[PDB]
PDB file of C-alpha atoms in Angstrom:
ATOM      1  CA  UNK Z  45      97.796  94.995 101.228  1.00 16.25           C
ATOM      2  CA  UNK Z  46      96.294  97.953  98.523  1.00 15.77           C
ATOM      3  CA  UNK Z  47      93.624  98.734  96.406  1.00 13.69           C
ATOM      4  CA  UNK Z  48      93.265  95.589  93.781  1.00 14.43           C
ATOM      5  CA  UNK Z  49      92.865  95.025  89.983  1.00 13.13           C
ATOM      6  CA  UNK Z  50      91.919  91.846  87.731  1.00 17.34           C
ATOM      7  CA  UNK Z  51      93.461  90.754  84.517  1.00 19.70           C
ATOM      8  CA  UNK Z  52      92.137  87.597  82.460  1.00 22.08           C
ATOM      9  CA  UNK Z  53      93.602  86.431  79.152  1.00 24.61           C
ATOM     10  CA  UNK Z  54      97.156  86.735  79.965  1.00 24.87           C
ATOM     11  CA  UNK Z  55     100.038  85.118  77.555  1.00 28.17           C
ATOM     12  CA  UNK Z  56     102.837  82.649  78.086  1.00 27.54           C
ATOM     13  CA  UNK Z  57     105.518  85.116  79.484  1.00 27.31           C
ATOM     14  CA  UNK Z  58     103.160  86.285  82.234  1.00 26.78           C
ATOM     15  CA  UNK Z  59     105.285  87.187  85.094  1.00 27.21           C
ATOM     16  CA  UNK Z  60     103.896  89.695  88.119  1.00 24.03           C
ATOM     17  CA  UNK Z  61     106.491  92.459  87.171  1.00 22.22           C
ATOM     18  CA  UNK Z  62     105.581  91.612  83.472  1.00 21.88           C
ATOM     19  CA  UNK Z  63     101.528  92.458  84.049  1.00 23.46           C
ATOM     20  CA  UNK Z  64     101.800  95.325  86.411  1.00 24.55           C
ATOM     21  CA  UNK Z  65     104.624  97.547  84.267  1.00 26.98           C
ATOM     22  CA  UNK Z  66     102.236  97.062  81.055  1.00 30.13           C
ATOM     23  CA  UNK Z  67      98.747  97.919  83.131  1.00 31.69           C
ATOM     24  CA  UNK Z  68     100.806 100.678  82.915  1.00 33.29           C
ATOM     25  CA  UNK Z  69     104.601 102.607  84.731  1.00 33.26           C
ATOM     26  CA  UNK Z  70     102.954 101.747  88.092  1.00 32.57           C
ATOM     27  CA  UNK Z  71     104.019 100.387  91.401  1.00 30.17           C
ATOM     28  CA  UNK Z  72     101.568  98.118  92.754  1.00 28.64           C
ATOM     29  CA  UNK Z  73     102.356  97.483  96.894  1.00 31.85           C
ATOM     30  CA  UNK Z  74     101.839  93.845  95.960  1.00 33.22           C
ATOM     31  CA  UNK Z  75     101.166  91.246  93.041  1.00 31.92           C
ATOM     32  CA  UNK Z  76      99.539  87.924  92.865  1.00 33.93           C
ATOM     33  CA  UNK Z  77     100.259  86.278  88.891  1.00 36.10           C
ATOM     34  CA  UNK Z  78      97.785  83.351  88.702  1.00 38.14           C
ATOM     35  CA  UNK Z  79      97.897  80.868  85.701  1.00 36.81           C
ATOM     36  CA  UNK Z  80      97.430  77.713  83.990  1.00 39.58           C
ATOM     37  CA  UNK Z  81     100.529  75.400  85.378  1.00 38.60           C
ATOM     38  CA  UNK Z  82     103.185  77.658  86.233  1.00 36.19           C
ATOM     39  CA  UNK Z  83     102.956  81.313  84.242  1.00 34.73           C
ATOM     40  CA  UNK Z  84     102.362  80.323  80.729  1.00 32.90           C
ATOM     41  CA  UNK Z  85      98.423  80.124  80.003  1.00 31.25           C
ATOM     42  CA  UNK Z  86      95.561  81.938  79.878  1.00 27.82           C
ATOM     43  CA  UNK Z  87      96.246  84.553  82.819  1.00 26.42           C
ATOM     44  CA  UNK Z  88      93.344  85.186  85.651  1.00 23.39           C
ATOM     45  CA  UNK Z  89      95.916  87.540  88.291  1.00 21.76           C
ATOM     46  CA  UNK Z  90      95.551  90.510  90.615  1.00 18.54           C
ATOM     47  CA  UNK Z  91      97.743  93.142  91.593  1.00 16.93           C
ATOM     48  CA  UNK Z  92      97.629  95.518  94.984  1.00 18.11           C
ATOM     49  CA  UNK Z  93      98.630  98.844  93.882  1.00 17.85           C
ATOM     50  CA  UNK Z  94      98.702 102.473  95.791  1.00 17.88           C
ATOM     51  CA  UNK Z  95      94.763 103.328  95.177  1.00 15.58           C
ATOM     52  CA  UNK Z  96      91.994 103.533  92.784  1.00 16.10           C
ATOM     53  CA  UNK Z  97      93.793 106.746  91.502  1.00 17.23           C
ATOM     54  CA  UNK Z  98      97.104 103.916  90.659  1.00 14.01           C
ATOM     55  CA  UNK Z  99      94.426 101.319  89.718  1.00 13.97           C
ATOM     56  CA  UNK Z 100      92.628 103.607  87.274  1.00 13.90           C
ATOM     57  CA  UNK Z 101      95.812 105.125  85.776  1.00 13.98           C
ATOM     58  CA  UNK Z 102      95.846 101.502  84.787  1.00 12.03           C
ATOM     59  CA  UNK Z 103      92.547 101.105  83.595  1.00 12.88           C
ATOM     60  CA  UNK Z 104      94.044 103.874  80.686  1.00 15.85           C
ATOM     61  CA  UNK Z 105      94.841 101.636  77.603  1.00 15.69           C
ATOM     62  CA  UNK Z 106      93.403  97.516  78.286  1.00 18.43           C
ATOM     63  CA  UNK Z 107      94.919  96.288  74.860  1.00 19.35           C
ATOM     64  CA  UNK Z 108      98.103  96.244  76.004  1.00 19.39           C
ATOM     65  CA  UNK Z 109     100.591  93.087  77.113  1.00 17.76           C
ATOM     66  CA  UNK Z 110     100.036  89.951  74.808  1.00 15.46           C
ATOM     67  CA  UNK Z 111     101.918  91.039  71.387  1.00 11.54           C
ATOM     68  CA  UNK Z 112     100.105  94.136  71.473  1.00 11.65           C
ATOM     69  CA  UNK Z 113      96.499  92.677  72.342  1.00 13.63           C
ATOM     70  CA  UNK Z 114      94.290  92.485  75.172  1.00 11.97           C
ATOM     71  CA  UNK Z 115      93.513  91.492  78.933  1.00 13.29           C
ATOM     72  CA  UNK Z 116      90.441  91.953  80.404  1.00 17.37           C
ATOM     73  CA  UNK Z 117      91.768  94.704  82.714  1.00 16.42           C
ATOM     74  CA  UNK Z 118      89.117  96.074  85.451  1.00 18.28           C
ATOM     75  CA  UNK Z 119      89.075  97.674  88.989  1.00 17.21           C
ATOM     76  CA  UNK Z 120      87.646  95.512  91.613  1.00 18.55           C
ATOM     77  CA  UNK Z 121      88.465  98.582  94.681  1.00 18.72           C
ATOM     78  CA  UNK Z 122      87.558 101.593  96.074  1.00 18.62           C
ATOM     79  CA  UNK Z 123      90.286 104.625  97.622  1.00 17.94           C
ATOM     80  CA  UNK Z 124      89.634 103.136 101.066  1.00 17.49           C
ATOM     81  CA  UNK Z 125      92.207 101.458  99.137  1.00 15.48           C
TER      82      UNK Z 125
END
């Protein structure tokens, strides 16, 4: 669908709208939220956003989500998307 970008650590109230608004005020074109059972343990998700230029605005502040602490947060595409 987009460009993509890769999150591992994430905390028991991932939810796709949840990871994509802290990677930062983006709008990925799509989300996948990838878990444990069923979006409560130890995260491993990527989300489809409007380029590397969306992506990287993302790639601004890592840290971020789990009661302020960290994700591994990193591009995986390209601006072809």
């Amino acid at each position: 669908t987009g460009h993509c970008v890769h999150m591992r650590g994430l905390p028991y109230k991932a939810t796709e709208n949840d990871i994509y608004n802290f990677f930062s005020p983006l709008n990925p074109v799509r989300v996948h939220i990838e878990i444990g059972p069923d979006g409560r343990v130890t995260g491993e998700a990527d989300v489809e956003f409007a380029t590397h230029e969306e992506a990287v605005a993302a790639m601004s502040k890592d840290r971020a989500n789990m009661q302020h602490r960290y994700i591994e947060l990193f591009l995986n595409s390209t601006t072809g998307a």
